[PDB]
Amino acid sequence: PPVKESSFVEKMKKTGRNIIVFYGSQTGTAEEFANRLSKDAHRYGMRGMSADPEEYDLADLSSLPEIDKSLVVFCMATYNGDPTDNAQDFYDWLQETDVDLTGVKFAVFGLGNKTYEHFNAMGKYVDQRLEQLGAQRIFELGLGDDDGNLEEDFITWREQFWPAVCEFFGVEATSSIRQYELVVHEDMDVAKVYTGEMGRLKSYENQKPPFDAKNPFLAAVTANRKLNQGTERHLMHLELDISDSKIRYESGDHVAVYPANDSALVNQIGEILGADLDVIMSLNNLDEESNKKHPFPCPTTYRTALTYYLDITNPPRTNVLYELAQYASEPSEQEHLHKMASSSGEGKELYLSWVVEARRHILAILQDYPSLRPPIDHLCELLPRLQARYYSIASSSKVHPNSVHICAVAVEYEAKSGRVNKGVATSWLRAKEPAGRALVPMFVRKSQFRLPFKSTTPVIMVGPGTGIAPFMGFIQERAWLREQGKEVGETLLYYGCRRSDEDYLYREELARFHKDGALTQLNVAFSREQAHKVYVQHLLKRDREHLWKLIHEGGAHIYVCGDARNMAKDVQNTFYDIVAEFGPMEHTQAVDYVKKLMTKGRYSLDVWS
Numbered sequence: 188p189p190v191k192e193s194s195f196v197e198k199m200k201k202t203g204r205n206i207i208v209f210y211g212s213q214t215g216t217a218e219e220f221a222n223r224l225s226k227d228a229h230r231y232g233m234r235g236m237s238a239d240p241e242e243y244d245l246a247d248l249s250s251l252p253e254i255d256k257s258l259v260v261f262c263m264a265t266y267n268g269d270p271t272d273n274a275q276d277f278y279d280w281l282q283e284t285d286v287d288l289t290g291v292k293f294a295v296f297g298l299g300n301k302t303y304e305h306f307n308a309m310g311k312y313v314d315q316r317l318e319q320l321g322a323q324r325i326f327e328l329g330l331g332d333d334d335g336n337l338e339e340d341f342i343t344w345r346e347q348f349w350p351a352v353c354e355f356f357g358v359e360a361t362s363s364i365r366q367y368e369l370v371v372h373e374d375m376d377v378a379k380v381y382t383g384e385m386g387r388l389k390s391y392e393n394q395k396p397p398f399d400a401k402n403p404f405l406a407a408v409t410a411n412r413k414l415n416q417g418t419e420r421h422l423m424h425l426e427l428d429i430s431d432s433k434i435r436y437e438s439g440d441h442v443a444v445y446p447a448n449d450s451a452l453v454n455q456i457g458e459i460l461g462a463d464l465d466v467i468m469s470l471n472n473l474d475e476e477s478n479k480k481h482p483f484p485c486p487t488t489y490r491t492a493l494t495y496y497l498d499i500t501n502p503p504r505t506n507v508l509y510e511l512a513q514y515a516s517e518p519s520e521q522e523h524l525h526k527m528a529s530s531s532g533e534g535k536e537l538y539l540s541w542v543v544e545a546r547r548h549i550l551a552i553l554q555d556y557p558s559l560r561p562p563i564d565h566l567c568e569l570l571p572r573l574q575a576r577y578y579s580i581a582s583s584s585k586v587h588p589n590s591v592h593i594c595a596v597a598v599e600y601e602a603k604s605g606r607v608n609k610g611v612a613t614s615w616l617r618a619k620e621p622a623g624r625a626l627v628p629m630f631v632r633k634s635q636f637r638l639p640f641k642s643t644t645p646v647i648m649v650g651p652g653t654g655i656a657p658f659m660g661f662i663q664e665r666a667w668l669r670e671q672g673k674e675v676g677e678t679l680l681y682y683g684c685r686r687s688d689e690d691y692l693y694r695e696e697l698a699r700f701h702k703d704g705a706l707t708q709l710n711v712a713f714s715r716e717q718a719h720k721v722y723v724q725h726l727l728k729r730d731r732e733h734l735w736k737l738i739h740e741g742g743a744h745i746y747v748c749g750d751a752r753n754m755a756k757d758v759q760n761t762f763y764d765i766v767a768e769f770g771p772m773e774h775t776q777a778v779d780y781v782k783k784l785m786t787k788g789r790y791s792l793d794v795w796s
């Protein structure tokens with residue numbers, strides 16, 4: 188619980204702001220959107236500001252009417268049906284408060300993903316709640332879908348939002364504007380230069396607990412081995428030494444890591460722009476009143492910024508390309524970049540195929556539109572921040588209290604852009620070689636994916652491919668409970684891979700556990716050892732009788748991990764069918780029954796894309 192800032196309304200008054208855009212974000216997208224909306228205000232005679240709801244008391248919303256033509260916008264993302272961490276406070280307040288918001292004008296743009304159970308739950312909630320409290324909606328709720336193209340949904344909403352705002356407040360719709368100023372440092376002492384740390388200067392060198400997202404622990408990579416036999420893919424297992432970090436974790440938790448971009452990619456960006464990446468500088472907010480003094484840790488070199496603080500691989504969003512159009516000396520290229528921000532037409536189609544679908548990163552665009560040569564400092568101000576990557580801890584703290592295990596597949600594919608794209612965190616992790624030791628800045632994030640409290644409760648685990656990760660931890664722990672004399676219920680694993688002798692991850696360890704009885708059943712679907720595809724859900728269907736027994740009589744907990752795209756849903760449907768047959772009951776009731784298991788904490792998910 189952070190110390191709240193002074194009333195955001197009083198701040199708006201002292202700075203002449205009439206619009207405030209709050210962001211509920213975890214990977215920085217909502218914050219990006221909020222900043223874009225805040226900046227838009229300027230182009231409409233108004234003036235806004237972005238703000239972290241966590242640093243304020245939203246009860247002060249009731250004072251917003253004291254500012255003429257005032258307006259609050261909420262750009263909120265949803266995470267596992269809940270508010271983002273930074274907006275949990277706002278959410279709890281919204282539920283317990285009874286404050287009257289008469290006179291308050293708002294608008295909400297929800298960032299979500301249709302593939303989840305509770306799509307845009309937070310945005311939908313905030314939008315409905317503010318109205319119930321007496322506030323009035325100035326523009327319809329925006330429903331962004333990261334499963335299609337969030338950026339386009341945002342563009343569309345934003346394009347209609349502003350005219351609606353202008354029409355209601357009687358405002359007019361009336362250029363390039365830097366948010367930061369560049370200050371090169373020639374006489375800069377080395378001890379004051381950021382070299383990639385996230386919080387306090389030298390926090391990576393001088394490690395002080397407790398460690399978290401703002402102060403990650405640099406864990407030594409003690410192991411890093413290939414898990415599969417083939418060469419088409421690279422699946423790996425790493426062990427991070429967290430001794431003396433005082434960090435605690437449990438099977439089911441996730442470990443986050445801050446990676447470094449590819450040095451060659453960073454080098455080329457500087458080389459193509461003819462910039463000296465080793466120039467030590469700082470980018471200082473031109474708004475001396477904003478709490479955001481820099482876009483990232485400063486002072487630091489461009490090289491360090493592009494390596495540790497900036498995202499240089501993901502397809503640039505439209506506003507970035509829009510702002511860069513001014514630096515392309517070829518009219519046709521400036522025109523293309525300019526139209527990427529269109530809400531329809533060829534400009535939109537080109538953005539979706541040439542940039543998104545092709546997966547062109549910033550360097551790719553700089554190479555494919557050679558007249559585009561922006562100054563390095565402005566590019567750094569425009570790029571999004573490099574985010575940490577999450578991995579499902581593959582070990583049990585009951586067995587490995589001082590080590591965190593990771594099971595992952597290295598990302599590397601041929602993009603239609605014409606080049607081979609490499610996954611940032613996985614290429615970096617793959618390069619980490621045990622024993623100048625190899626360090627991984629990291630931190631643990633607690634999750635609700637947990638083994639049952641009672642050792643006697645049966646467990647049904649389903650995790651094909653890398654989805655096996657959390658379960659290696661579950662299995663280690665359940666075996667441990669047995670070795671300790673505890674009474675353990677059935678422990679079932681439904682795992683899957685292409686072929687027994689090619690990508691059967693942890694084959695040896697799983698055989699051992701099965702032999703010893705830690706694993707009651709080891710059901711493996713080898714999808715390519717026969718003409719037909721054989722998947723985990725096929726084995727669940729096979730064992731439908733017994734699984735129903737465990738679910739209906741034993742109170743078994745279900746766990747699904749891995750591919751959220753198709754595997755998760757296919758597995759869920761098979762459970763719908765098992766319930767419909769043995770209940771018995773109509774599909775409609777089977778679906779309700781399964782979704783009820785989820786709320787009662789007996790059907791947990793740890794899926795990703």
Ligand SMILES: Cc1cc2nc3c(=O)[nH]c(=O)nc-3n(C[C@H](O)[C@H](O)[C@H](O)COP(=O)(O)OP(=O)(O)OC[C@H]3O[C@@H](n4cnc5c(N)ncnc54)[C@H](O)[C@@H]3O)c2cc1C
Pocket residue numbers: 441500546576577578579580594595596598599600609610611612613614653656793794795796
């Ligand atoms: C909660 C959670 C748990 C996770 N657990 C694990 C885990 O235990 N093990 C694990 O392996 N991963 C897991 N991940 C995924 C992990 O966080 C990273 O997203 C993944 O490892 C890739 O990161 P990267 O930085 O290497 O690739 P990035 O540089 O982040 O690139 C990823 C992007 O590349 C694009 N891409 C990937 N393949 C292709 C393709 N072939 N064709 C076109 N585009 C493609 C997609 O846009 C993809 O999102 C988890 C993710 C979440 C959210």
Ligand SMILES: Cc1cc2nc3c(=O)[nH]c(=O)nc-3n(C[C@H](O)[C@H](O)[C@H](O)COP(=O)(O)O)c2cc1C
Pocket residue numbers: 211212213214215216217218264265266267268269271298299300301303304305306307308333337
């Ligand atoms: C672990 C995880 C869980 C998510 N859970 C949900 C969810 O329940 N509902 C939803 O609509 N979107 C969900 N999403 C999608 C995000 O809401 C969407 O990607 C959003 O754009 C992220 O915004 P941010 O960068 O501002 O945090 C999830 C994403 C991740 C990575």
Ligand SMILES: Nc1ncnc2c1ncn2[C@@H]1O[C@H](CO)[C@@H](O)[C@H]1OP(=O)(O)O
Pocket residue numbers: 651652653683684685712713714715720722723724753754755757
């Ligand atoms: N829709 C799905 N449901 C369950 N498993 C799937 C799946 N799609 C692919 N798989 C399998 O998940 C395992 C890990 O990726 C692979 O054996 C893969 O088989 P396939 O690649 O032969 O289709």
